Design a protein around this ligand. Structure first.
Ligand SMILES: Cc1cc2nc3c(=O)[nH]c(=O)nc-3n(C[C@H](O)[C@H](O)[C@H](O)COP(=O)(O)OP(=O)(O)OC[C@H]3O[C@@H](n4cnc5c(N)ncnc54)[C@H](O)[C@@H]3O)c2cc1C
Ligand SMILES: Cc1cc2nc3c(=O)[nH]c(=O)nc-3n(C[C@H](O)[C@H](O)[C@H](O)COP(=O)(O)OP(=O)(O)OC[C@H]3O[C@@H](n4cnc5c(N)ncnc54)[C@H](O)[C@@H]3O)c2cc1C
Ligand SMILES: OC[C@H]1O[C@@H](O)[C@H](F)[C@@H](O)[C@@H]1O
Ligand SMILES: OC[C@H]1O[C@@H](O)[C@H](F)[C@@H](O)[C@@H]1O
Ligand SMILES: OC[C@H]1O[C@@H](O)[C@H](F)[C@@H](O)[C@@H]1O
Lengths: 577, 577, 52, 104
């Protein structure tokens, strides 16, 4: 470990990996630190769902997700236990216990918010949905020139999509996917369009999908190496980055202070360029701990000297959720084209279809699958093949239905009674609302309480804004109830409901982007450079300043790409001596 | 991947690794196949609880455990869901769905039995408790000579303890450990002995314990390499081993049939020596799939030609559990040596003691931690330091109390109401019973249903034997109730209970050891060699033929070491070429 | 059911359970105010909550 | 079979039933308010010894029914409240409200 690099990156998630891919590739000497450790096998920072065992037992993956999500702010617990033994030691008060945050108002929280600390960040467990934002959801990169704006976002998104390997074809031959996609297409004919969710993923076989991750963007191997003998890159896991050191003039960062969690050693790392990609919460923490914004409970009678908008205007999406059990009508439609001679299990039972006939409602590939399934598994009462892939359907946000939608299956922990229902019948519904940025909605850091790494403890002051955000979120709930009913009734145990605030993990706006610090109430410019500072950049959904419903990571990655172009045009790589 | 090795080992768990360590170390050319994949970080097969994140958030580790335990046999679900919408597709029967096993009698199951498929096996997540068995629990290695049988066990256990890095001192200065330890010592003085649970672990610092695993036994790195230039070892993950091929005389194994899960191709591997260490369930499955024993529902009219004891006499321990909240008296005792003056938060608050005073009930190291906690955290109402490690107490199995005990804390998922109780108060109680081997208790494999790897579906036919087993299980429950009340009353939500059968994962006897196949109703001899076969060996808790209550892995490793002694005397390593 | 139907709790302390999955449009409390016959005199930690 | 064991509780001056001077109940009467904890010392030790006694004795008949494991019930669920207007020979000496004929 040197202590002088061209570029240092804090965080090895997909956004840090975007900076790495761009800057390592352009010849800079790059160090990346991550407070977490390598834990996706030999492919560093790769998707943990890409093991044969998880793709045969997908519902177990929920435990992997839960195991690495650590709650950001947990209020003091006031649940009464009054059935202790009289001999057991007992509290007279609900005192600060069990890592709870006494700063946290339990009624103005994002109780669902959590962070992950592993190499690869949240991309070792994420669902891989990467839609583009339309204009109404998207920050402007060019003022007063809609077409120029559009072109710039097209070029960045196309590049981001290549890095993630985003595609809309990985589920094209799923019977369940096509069953739901065709029905919803028909029902909303002339009204809404439906398609496959854009997914960062490559199919490898009929039973295996390689989901993308940080590793997809950048493999995280130390360079130089055999395949990259001219590149320079070092990854340092289990290193807590704690502060960037400002010069007295607040025009430049002078070092990054770290704490190696294994040796216990604390160093200053020097670089030309400092990039913070630790996530929407921990970027803000690192900044506040370095003297940006304001530490402690917001006090608007003492406004901060640097980045007064830091940690304000935070946005988190409303999320509604249910599951359905496919209608009888749709299930019967699956076998619409079959002629069924006789009795299942009995001697002459035949299921047959005429290939390429024109009364056929289904393509030959479908009918053939359905045929072999009903013939080979005569004891099974459903026409859907056992190994048929999940549905992955969306109708994308539009002015007339301004929410993102996913009609699909991701890993789920079904109750015993729910496991009574055959999984081929189940569809998840998740609709995601956009939230108006409001100055009163804040993430702030305690000047007294600290987290597990002895950093200032994150505290939320959040409610969904009145007005359009709240009206739309409720409109969105109704829309899910109306559309889901076209496919089947609600699965008992998974009835329509709003999820705990922040459970969705799409937090944005914590260190938001804009053209002008003061006029646009922002912290970085469109190159993702911190105002006033020559050499400090932030990446991640924390940059997104708009109200958006679609999943934000592709948009953050596009911004990181743009940011790297500024870096390449402004900093010269060291000579590789 | 070569076609020919000196030794092939199926499974990379701690037992497979024992064979690797011994045989690789002796110069054999070894290959090891594991159906699961590398996912423990850079240390292959290492304990997943060794990350800084899990040592700061230990309760989250329960998710890691649950994420890799897949249920062995799940009976057909007969739960009634009668609140579906009329439009949803509804079953007329409880048909075979969701991977359930229709062979399984739901009232004769080990429903809690589960298996792991990852490199390192269950040792990536285990609790690391490695007690020796006393004579009462332990199979004979030497007949008609108890002193020599004793000496042989002592030699083998001592070596197995060195491989696991077993110790009894990693918690010696925890306040909570000593508080429970000393109290129980006093309460049972002259009746039972208490000590630390022997743990396979090394303490690296006050807040970090490096738990041992397969990796500790053998690092699983391909050889030759720089540190072992003369050794030969290859590990092949994601390879399902499917059959060992018998010669027609049933006297030798001729090869191992594998299914490469990534390419999807099937191959044969040849070796001089075939060692099966895939765990107590999958060793038996592999053997049955290879023509040993009997496929299908067992039928005495038609006893198997080979190993008629395979899959019979299986044992699983009864397990009772509760948690307690520390008594007021014990908590108050923690600060008994203190002089407390003034009131908290005020300038005159004073907590002091006299180091070395004869009247002190506690040692100086304890008092100083207590003083510092109370002075530095005057708002906290407890005298136990925040970072005080877990208790790890046991009274080992004896004839007057024939169960193993653990009075301790391992990762746990506390309900919201339980989280109301400060964790420093909570102690886990787990008592483990021994189970008499009975011919009627069986693990068998379906001739019709297959598992997720297309192998015969395991099915249990099990009940705790009447007589001694059942009596001692209920007496064991009573003892937990009596002993635990000495420390504190029950935690609501974790009241005394038997755990689902097999949740304990201490399954034994599925391929059991003995001196004589017929007389001792067994499958392998004391060298772990399958009767009749020159070159086939079985390692794991499946070998253990006795009723035992202590945790079995250390005993299984000891037998593996003895097996390797036989191999080294009877086979010659190929020349290094 | 008969027993339960006629046992009226003597003193129920103010309820502090958090419901944070209400829809954004629903009216929502900024404090745990005295609601639903609860007794603000009652310390929930020194009660006979089962008295009826 | 159900098992219910009932412990005795030492009368202590600090354990009180009192009535609010502001809050009223459904009949517009002063709202009852408890200030109660099981006394330390004998009451508490005997409660936990009673729990253990139930565990030991019940095992002679059979094991616990899942969902009805050994537990303390919520304070006052038992409805055996006494001492709120207690009897003694001397109002002052016996700290009481009624005499042995129950007259105030
Ligand atoms: C289960 C789940 C499903 C999701 N599904 C989707 C989806 O379908 N689509 C979508 O767009 N998004 C999804 N997301 C969100 C997505 O994963 C995140 O948007 C994306 O990972 C953010 O990238 P990032 O690189 O900015 O931050 P992260 O992935 O959070 O990485 C930040 C890194 O910084 C590290 N770090 C934190 N503190 C320090 C410190 N002090 N010092 C050094 N390092 C530190 C952390 O260890 C972490 O590795 C999902 C998330 C979850 C977990
Ligand atoms: C949460 C938990 C806590 C535990 N705590 C303790 C404890 O404190 N003390 C104790 O003694 N024991 C404990 N155990 C039990 C202990 O882990 C096991 O006894 C031990 O790991 C057995 O070692 P093994 O090598 O025989 O088998 P395993 O560890 O089971 O390894 C078998 C390997 O074979 C592989 N395999 C399976 N099928 C195939 C296939 N067909 N082809 C190729 N490979 C295959 C599997 O992937 C696995 O890696 C615990 C277990 C769990 C999960
Ligand atoms: O649980 C919340 C998550 O669920 C998925 O369906 C999404 F694709 C994500 O964007 C999201 O973070
Ligand atoms: O959950 C059951 C397990 O719990 C632990 O406390 C033990 F040490 C184990 O040996 C066992 O497998
Ligand atoms: O639930 C408490 C009650 O339960 C019964 O078993 C008793 F007989 C009563 O004295 C008591 O009021």
């Amino acid at each position: 470990m040197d202590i002088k690099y061209d570029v240092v990156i804090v965080g090895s998630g997909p956004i840090g990996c975007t900076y790495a891919r761009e800057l390592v590739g352009a010849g800079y000497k790059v160090a990346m630190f991550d407070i977490g450790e390598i834990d996706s096998g030999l492919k560093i920072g790769a998707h943990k769902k890409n093991t044969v065992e998880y793709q045969k037992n997908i519902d177990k993956f929920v435990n992997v997700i839960q195991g690495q999500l650590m709650s950001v702010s947990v209020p003091v617990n006031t649940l009464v236990v009054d059935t202790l033994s009289p001999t057991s030691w007992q509290a007279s008060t609900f005192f600060v216990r069990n890592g709870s945050n006494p700063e946290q108002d339990p009624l103005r929280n994002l109780s669902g918010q959590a962070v992950t600390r592993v190499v690869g960040g949240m991309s070792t467990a994420w669902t891989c949905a990467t839609p583009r934002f339309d204009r109404e959801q998207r920050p402007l990169l060019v003022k007063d020139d809609a077409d120029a704006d559009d072109a710039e976002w097209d070029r960045l998104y196309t590049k981001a999509e290549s890095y993630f390997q985003t595609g809309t074809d990985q589920f094209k031959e799923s019977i369940r996917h096509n069953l739901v996609l065709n029905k919803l297409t028909e029902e909303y004919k002339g009204q809404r369009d439906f398609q496959q969710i854009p997914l960062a993923a490559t199919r490898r076989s009929p039973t295996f999908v390689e989901w993308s991750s940080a590793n997809t963007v950048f493999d995280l191997q130390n360079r130089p190496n055999t395949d990259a003998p001219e590149e320079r890159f070092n990854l340092f896991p289990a290193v807590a980055c704690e502060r960037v050191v400002r010069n007295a003039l607040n025009s430049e960062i002078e070092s990054l202070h770290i704490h190696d969690l294994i040796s216990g050693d604390r160093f200053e790392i020097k670089a030309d360029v400092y990039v913070l990609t630790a996530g929407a919460v921990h970027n803000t923490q690192l900044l506040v701990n370095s003297g940006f914004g304001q530490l402690g409970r917001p006090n608007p009678a003492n406004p901060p000297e640097l980045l007064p908008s830091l940690g304000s205007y935070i946005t988190e999406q409303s999320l509604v959720f249910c599951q359905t059990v496919m209608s009888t009508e749709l299930i019967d439609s699956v076998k619409s084209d079959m002629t069924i001679r006789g009795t299942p299990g009995e001697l002459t039972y035949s299921v047959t279809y005429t290939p390429g006939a024109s009364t056929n409602k289904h393509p030959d590939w479908w009918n053939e699958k359905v045929k072999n399934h009903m013939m080979q598994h005569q004891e099974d009462p459903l026409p859907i093949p056992f190994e048929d892939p999940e549905p992955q359907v969306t109708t994308l946000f539009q002015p007339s239905h301004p929410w993102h939608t996913q009609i699909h299956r991701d890993a789920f922990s079904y109750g015993a009674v729910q496991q009574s229902i055959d999984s081929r019948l189940i569809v998840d519904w998740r609709f995601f609302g956009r939230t108006e940025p409001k100055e009163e909605n804040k993430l702030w850091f305690s000047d007294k309480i600290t987290d597990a790494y002895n950093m200032p403890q994150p505290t939320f002051d959040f409610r969904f804004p009145a007005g359009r955000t709240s009206k739309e979120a409720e409109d969105m709930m109704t829309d899910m109830c109306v559309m889901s009913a076209k496919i089947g009734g609600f699965l008992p145990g998974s009835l329509p409901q709003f999820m705990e605030p922040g459970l969705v993990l799409h937090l944005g706006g914590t260190h938001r982007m804009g053209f002008d610090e003061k006029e646009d109430n922002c912290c970085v410019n469109t190159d993702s450079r911190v105002f006033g500072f020559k050499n400090l950049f932030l990446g991640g959904c924390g940059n997104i300043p708009t109200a958006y419903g679609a999943n934000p990571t592709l948009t953050a990655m596009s911004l990181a790409i743009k940011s790297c172009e500024y870096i390449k045009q402004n900093f010269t790589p060291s000579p590789f001596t």
